[PDB]
Design a protein around this ligand. Structure first.
Ligand SMILES: C=C(CC(=O)OC)C(=O)N[C@@H](c1ccccc1)[C@@H](O)C(=O)O[C@H]1C[C@@]2(O)[C@@H](OC(=O)c3ccccc3)[C@@H]3[C@]4(OC(C)=O)CO[C@@H]4C[C@H](O)[C@@]3(C)C(=O)[C@H](O)C(=C1C)C2(C)C
Ligand SMILES: Nc1nc2c(ncn2[C@@H]2O[C@H](COP(=O)(O)OP(=O)(O)OP(=O)(O)O)[C@@H](O)[C@H]2O)c(=O)[nH]1
Ligand SMILES: Nc1ncnc2c1ncn2[C@@H]1O[C@H](COP(=O)(O)OP(=O)(O)CP(=O)(O)O)[C@@H](O)[C@H]1O
Ligand SMILES: Nc1nc2c(ncn2[C@@H]2O[C@H](COP(=O)(O)OP(=O)(O)O)[C@@H](O)[C@H]2O)c(=O)[nH]1
Ligand SMILES: [Ca+2]
Ligand SMILES: [Mg+2]
Ligand SMILES: [Mg+2]
Ligand SMILES: [Mg+2]
Lengths: 426, 319, 54, 441
């Protein structure tokens, strides 16, 4: 029994978090009322990882919902699976965070953070052997970014020997709510460099482009973006939720994926992705080639602009394991230039028999590539374009922050970019 | 697509083979220390054979036979012939030789004295010295293990010129241990009247670069000796090549091994005035004649490489 | 070739065939190492908690 | 009679131990409930099988075994498996969180908290022995528990059982079924720390077992179950001399005397034949000469390497089934004329042969066909050093960049232990080279 405690914070964090719980509840046979009604014991074998078992053989997500305004969590509670969450695990304020990292991290968020830690402590105390935490949030707003990283720091203080994992949505001017998003993201990224073990970098620019160019969605909504994320989150957690040999827990995943402590930012990918053809059967070569294509990756970085340190690939459904190996070793041997030579056998493959709801075959990609520096470079450029003229800083200095904290955050992320470039040339 | 690595930048034969592979559109060259290759053109010394054939999903081939050095080093070749029953010390096509360390020093003297008692000029090598009496041969070696070999005092001399020569034959052994003799050999001829050493390193009088090829040499044997190259010489050459390589086949064959080997060999022969062929040495990393580079290297790709890695009249004689 | 040491029983037999003749750290030392690694873990955690206190 | 205690560490050690004890029960006629209708001495005895099985007053034959793992799911299958009634709870030791493929976590952080309990349980078995001869330790090289905890346990066993022999069955990592990128680190770290505490270690390369299952059993993608049933047949062949009447390898010290002339070079190469599929209705039965010849085929070795390019220091042939000494000698004479078999000059050029008349047992419903005669050859050849060279090279590639090293330092280990371990492996490679080794032309 290796339990994971899930936290979703802010608007983006709770919207993507709600869809993640809808998806995996269906996979494990849990209905919106928390009753199991599946037909396979594999659905229950590792259900303890994400669900508590309450009275009457009911399953309650080990999930905590956090926000500084009630709006999004009201819509979650009134949503499809809104009644499955523990009512005491809704922790919310009223003032909001105003897309302001300082409000989430230092003022408004600091008033609420102790109440979230009370619920984290309650869930942790009921764990046979807690392995760690997973946080869903965006970096471009105030609550998920500012309060989310505050929560990570306080959790690390109270559980220093547990794994911290995040699904972090990176902002992009193409799918942007406010101009201060590079400020909030730059301040948050430094927190993640220090206080997380694994971070999935989900770029809203990549999600939009996939919806528009690949899925042929002329006007993608946030709901369309969150549909891609929930499918991806289900894929990357398959190894945690079903019986398997590879990356079966958060710490073994980290040991396999993170060769240097600060370089723990992963590019996720999913296949298939196609326009609505839809009933057409997918073959192993087609899954493998799509899963490794940049068009299927969600960090808007070109992996041919860098090199893979480590890769994890997860295949779902009934397929030929021999054929999976051939195509996986095929793409590996044919494109050996893009895998670092000093980490032998750095591509690991897992297969899970249970496929998602609507597909017979699927594949999920997790890459630790030095090309992720392009993401951090874009944020640094957008940060500097405003900070050079101290633009919009009054929103933050009004909350007590000084300009020196921005300078230090700028230097920290440029250091991170330089670290990636060191190993890209290695 | 197939992948290969280059580990010996000094090999002219395989610098050519690599550029032919890079002209088919189906071979890619990797960094020399990338382990995910199909073909290794390995280094001449200390090739890490123990790291081959352990890459999942990759058929791996290397251009050297592990253990072929026993044939391609002078001391070990003498020991192989004298200790292998397939060749015997009664071997008729290999000159009388002895391995002596600066040991067969005493047996050399008993054979030496018995024919001085009853010509006995010998040669030293492992840096060459030819002497008529044994006391001088031994003092030169104490100045690494050497061998003392009976010097051929009656060589076949080409005319006009009265000049010594030797024959170089290129032999390719593929992964199935098929023995291929390249149809083109070279005579490294001396340009001085008998001048005792015919190495191309040591000009251009009778033939360009002191190189006579088989077409001219066969024409000479017909005009001067009323015989052919095939009959008087090449039959013995094929016999010696087969005898040497079949002797070491159990030791070096990669038939049931996790990786595969092929190798190009350079056999050096001398011919006496009775048209008898003598084996001089076997070279494991030979160069080629400038004209025969294009044809032989293409033959290497066709016979040794494309046979294992298929692409999208034979120049060899199969022994 | 020669067979030596032929021993036979109801469940099998054994012998030898010759073809050619020829020609620690103490408990306290382990304990010190385990405790030295444990102290290094405690020092690294102490530095982390000091960093988080700042 | 002298008892032998088996210790199974980590997932690989536990699952392989499960397969071995199932096979032992079938070989000895022991039912899953522990009863053995052939043992007419109820509640005791000093027969050869008592080296591996104790006896209760109710007639249950209990393995002299301890299972240890840092997480519970693998040993839980022993508690609920077919042979669950064989073991009492004290033989099964589990933690709650594993070593995460981290030698430092298994040896230092977690090992320090559970070593005393493991030793207490082993002491309980040892107290039941009238003349304990030593331990057989099963573990992977690559896992954090199999590498880290095993080396700690071996150190303490040398302290507590100084006069006892210790043999290993070690699973060498193969990427085709490997679960961790850092397995070369764990392998070198555990080999360095365990080297002085092991008297004889049988390495089994998962790559060799995988390929044998694919080629000989026609299994397109072998599972751990496929691999472990093959491994348990080889282990059974090696340990049969301890469990049945005989004169060869009848005590653990004989393994060292017969196979290991120098203490550090104590890794014999195992080769097994014939491996034949159950699915085919009629196989041609291989003679003594054919199975003996197969012992010199690299495709049948437990580690892929070329013994033609090394030297032998000792060679044992362990036959099971319809084999008589006359045919073994005739087979050996033929093979020596046609094969590259060179011994070191300071060792006799000979084979020590053992024959057990019972044919190898197979598990019903398994993948191995029932054969009329089989053989396991144990040779100590310098050629196995190829496996060290492969591992040390992968170590060097990662360590030159210090990749993943922070995970080990984070658990209290020092970077100096990496280089100290690697230098020990370099000296080991040098030892094998000394013992076994004689352009533009
Ligand atoms: C619970 C849900 C939400 C839902 O949809 O319930 C309302 C869910 O998504 N679960 C799924 C899942 C997948 C991976 C891991 C875990 C779960 C799965 O089991 C399923 O149902 O996929 C759904 C998803 C589809 O919408 C659709 O995608 C989209 O248009 C779309 C639009 C915006 C964003 C993302 C997708 C979908 C794609 O996306 C997928 C995911 O396959 C896209 O390219 C994939 C190929 C599919 O062939 C193609 C084209 C379909 O046509 C198919 O007929 C279909 C299935 C199989 C839908 C039309 C209903
Ligand atoms: N042959 C065989 N190899 C196994 C088996 N289980 C694991 N392995 C190998 O062992 C290595 C992984 O080590 P494990 O034994 O699983 O790990 P562990 O000892 O339990 O240590 P931790 O899980 O890290 O605490 C990999 O190389 C696997 O291929 C098995 O049942 N049979
Ligand atoms: N026993 C012998 N009798 C007569 N001549 C001999 C001889 N041994 C060697 N030679 C002469 O020595 C020359 C080549 O010697 P050798 O082949 O040993 O040197 P080497 O190996 O450095 C040149 P390569 O690499 O091209 O074979 C030949 O031209 C030959 O004439
Ligand atoms: N993919 C996705 N991104 C979102 C969603 N909602 C907001 N965002 C992004 O998140 C950032 C705004 O942060 P938000 O979560 O709304 O602020 P918060 O409530 O203070 O944490 C911007 O970069 C938005 O593009 C969503 O539902 N899906
Ligand atoms: Ca008894
Ligand atoms: Mg918002
Ligand atoms: Mg384990
Ligand atoms: Mg030469």
């Amino acid at each position: 029994m290796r339990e994971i405690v899930h936290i979703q914070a802010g608007q983006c964090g709770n919207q993507i978090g709600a869809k993640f719980w809808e998806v995996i509840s269906d996979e494990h046979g849990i209905d919106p009322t928390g009753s199991y009604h599946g037909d396979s014991d594999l659905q229950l074998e590792r259900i303890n990882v994400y669900y508590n078992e309450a009275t009457g053989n009911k399953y309650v997500p080990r999930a905590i919902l956090v926000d500084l305004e009630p709006g999004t969590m009201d819509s979650v509670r009134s949503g499809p699976f809104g009644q499955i969450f523990r009512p005491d695990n809704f922790v919310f304020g009223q003032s909001g965070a105003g897309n302001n990292w300082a409000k989430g991290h230092y003022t408004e968020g600091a008033e609420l953070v102790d109440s979230v830690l009370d619920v984290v402590r309650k869930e942790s105390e009921s764990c046979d052997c807690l392995q760690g935490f997973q946080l869903t949030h965006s970096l471009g707003g105030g609550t998920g970014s500012g309060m989310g990283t505050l929560l990570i720091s306080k959790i690390r203080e109270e559980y220093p020997d547990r794994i911290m994992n995040t699904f972090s949505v990176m902002p992009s001017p193409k799918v942007s709510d406010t101009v201060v998003e590079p400020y909030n993201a730059t301040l948050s990224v430094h927190q993640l460099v220090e206080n997380t073990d694994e971070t999935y970098c989900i770029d809203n620019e990549a999600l939009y482009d996939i919806c528009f160019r690949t899925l042929k969605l002329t006007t993608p909504t946030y709901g369309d973006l969150n549909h891609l994320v929930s499918a991806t989150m289900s894929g990357v957690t398959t190894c945690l939720r079903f019986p398997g040999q590879l990356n079966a827990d958060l710490r073994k995943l980290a040991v396999n994926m993170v060769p240097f402590p600060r370089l723990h930012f992963f590019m996720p990918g999913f296949a298939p992705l196609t326009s609505r053809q839809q009933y057409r059967a997918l073959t192993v070569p087609e899954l493998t080639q799509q899963m490794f294509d940049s068009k299927n990756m969600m960090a808007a970085c070109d992996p041919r602009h860098g090199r893979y340190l480590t890769v994890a690939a997860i295949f779902r459904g009934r397929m030929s394991m021999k054929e999976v190996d051939e195509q996986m070793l095929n793409v590996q041997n044919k494109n050996s230039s893009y895998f670092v030579e000093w980490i032998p056998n750095n591509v690991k493959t897992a297969v899970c028999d249970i496929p998602p709801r609507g597909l017979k075959m699927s594949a999920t990609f997790i890459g630790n590539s030095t090309a992720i520096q392009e993401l951090f470079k874009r944020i640094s450029e957008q940060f500097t374009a405003m900070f050079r003229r101290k633009a919009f800083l009054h929103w933050y200095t009004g909350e007590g922050m000084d300009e020196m904290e921005f300078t230090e955050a700028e230097s920290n992320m440029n250091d991170l970019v330089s670290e990636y470039q060191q190993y890209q040339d290695a | 697509m197939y992948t290969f690595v280059v580990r010996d930048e000094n090999s002219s034969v395989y610098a050519e083979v690599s550029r032919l592979l890079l002209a088919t559109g189906q071979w890619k060259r990797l960094r020399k220390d990338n382990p995910r290759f199909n073909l290794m053109l390995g280094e001449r010394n200390r090739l890490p054979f123990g790291r081959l054939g352990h890459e999942p999903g990759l058929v791996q081939l290397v251009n050297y036979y592990r253990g072929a050095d026993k044939l391609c080093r002078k001391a070990s070749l003498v020991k192989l012939i004298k200790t292998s029953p397939e060749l015997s010390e009664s071997c008729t096509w290999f000159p009388e030789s002895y391995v002596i360390y600066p040991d067969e020093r005493e047996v050399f003297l008993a054979a030496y004295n018995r024919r001085r008692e009853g010509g006995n000029v010998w040669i030293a090598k492992s840096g060459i010295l030819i002497s008529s009496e044994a006391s001088e041969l031994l003092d030169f070696i104490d100045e690494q293990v050497h061998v003392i070999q009976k010097y051929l005092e009656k060589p076949l001399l080409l005319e006009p010129g009265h000049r010594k020569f030797d024959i170089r034959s290129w032999v390719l052994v593929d992964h199935l241990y098929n023995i291929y003799l390249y149809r083109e050999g070279v005579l490294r001829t001396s340009s001085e009247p008998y001048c005792h050493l015919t190495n191309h390193c040591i000009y251009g009088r009778y033939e360009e670069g002191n190189e006579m090829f088989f077409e001219e040499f066969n024409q000479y044997l017909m005009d001067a000796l009323n015989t052919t190259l095939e009959n008087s010489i090449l039959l013995q050459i094929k016999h010696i090549i087969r005898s040497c390589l079949m002797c070491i086949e159990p030791a070096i064959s990669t038939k049931h091994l996790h990786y595969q080997s092929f190798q190009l060999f350079g056999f050096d022969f001398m011919v006496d005035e009775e048209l008898k062929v003598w084996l001089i040495e076997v070279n494991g990393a030979p160069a080629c004649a400038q004209k025969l580079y294009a044809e032989l290297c293409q033959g290497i790709v066709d016979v040794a490489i494309s046979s294992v890695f298929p692409l999208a009249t034979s120049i060899f004689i199969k022994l | 070739m020669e067979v030596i040491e032929l021993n036979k029983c109801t469940s099998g037999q054994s012998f030898e065939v010759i073809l050619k003749p020829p020609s620690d750290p103490s408990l306290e030392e382990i304990q010190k190492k385990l405790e030295a690694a444990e102290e290094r873990r405690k020092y690294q955690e102490a530095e982390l908690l000091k960093h988080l206190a700042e | 009679m002298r008892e032998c205690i088996s210790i199974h560490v980590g997932q690989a050690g536990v699952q392989i131990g499960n397969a071995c004890w199932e096979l032992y029960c079938l070989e000895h006629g022991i039912q899953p409930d522990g009863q053995m209708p052939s043992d007419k001495t109820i509640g005791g005895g000093d027969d050869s099988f008592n080296t591996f099985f104790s006896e209760t007053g109710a007639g249950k034959h209990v393995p002299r075994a301890v299972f240890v793992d840092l997480e519970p799911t693998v040993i839980d299958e022993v508690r609920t498996g077919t042979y669950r009634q064989l073991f009492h709870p004290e033989q099964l030791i589990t933690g709650k969180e594993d070593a995460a493929n981290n030698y430092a976590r298994g040896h230092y952080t977690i090992g320090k908290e559970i070593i005393d309990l493991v030793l207490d349980r082993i002491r309980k078995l040892a107290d039941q022995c009238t003349g304990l001869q030593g331990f057989l330790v099963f573990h992977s090289f690559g896992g954090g528990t199999g590498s880290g905890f095993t080396s700690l346990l071996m150190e303490r066993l040398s302290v507590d059982y100084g006069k006892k022999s210790k043999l290993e069955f070690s699973i060498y990592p193969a990427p085709q079924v490997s679960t961790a990128v850092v397995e070369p680190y764990n392998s070198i770290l555990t080999t360095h720390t365990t080297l002085e505490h092991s008297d004889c270690a049988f390495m089994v390369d998962n790559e060799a077992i995988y390929d044998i299952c694919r080629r000989n059993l026609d299994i397109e993608r072998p599972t751990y179950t496929n691999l472990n049933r093959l491994i348990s047949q080889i282990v059974s062949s090696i340990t049969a001399s301890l469990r049945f009447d005989g004169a060869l390898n009848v005590d653990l010290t004989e393994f060292q005397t017969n196979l290991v002339p120098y203490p550090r070079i104590h890794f014999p190469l195992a080769t097994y034949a014939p491996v034949i599929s159950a699915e085919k209705a009629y196989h041609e039965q291989l003679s003594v000469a054919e199975i003996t010849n197969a012992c010199f085929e690299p495709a049948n070795q437990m580690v892929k390497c070329d013994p033609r390019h090394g030297k032998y220091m000792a060679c044992c042939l362990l036959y099971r089934g319809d084999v008589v000494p006359k045919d073994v000698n005739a087979a050996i004479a033929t093979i020596k004329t046609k094969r590259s078999i060179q011994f070191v000059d300071w060792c006799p050029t000979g084979f020590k042969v053992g024959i057990n008349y019972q044919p190898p047992t197979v598990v019903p419903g398994g993948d191995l066909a029932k054969v009329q005669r089989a053989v396991c050859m144990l040779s100590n050849t310098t050629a196995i050093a190829e496996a060290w060279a492969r591992l040390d090279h992968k170590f060097d590639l990662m360590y030159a960049k210090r990749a993943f090293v922070h995970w080990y330092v984070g658990e209290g280990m020092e970077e100096g232990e990496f280089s100290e371990a690697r230098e020990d492996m370099a000296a080991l490679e040098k030892d094998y080279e000394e013992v076994g080794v004689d352009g533009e032309e």
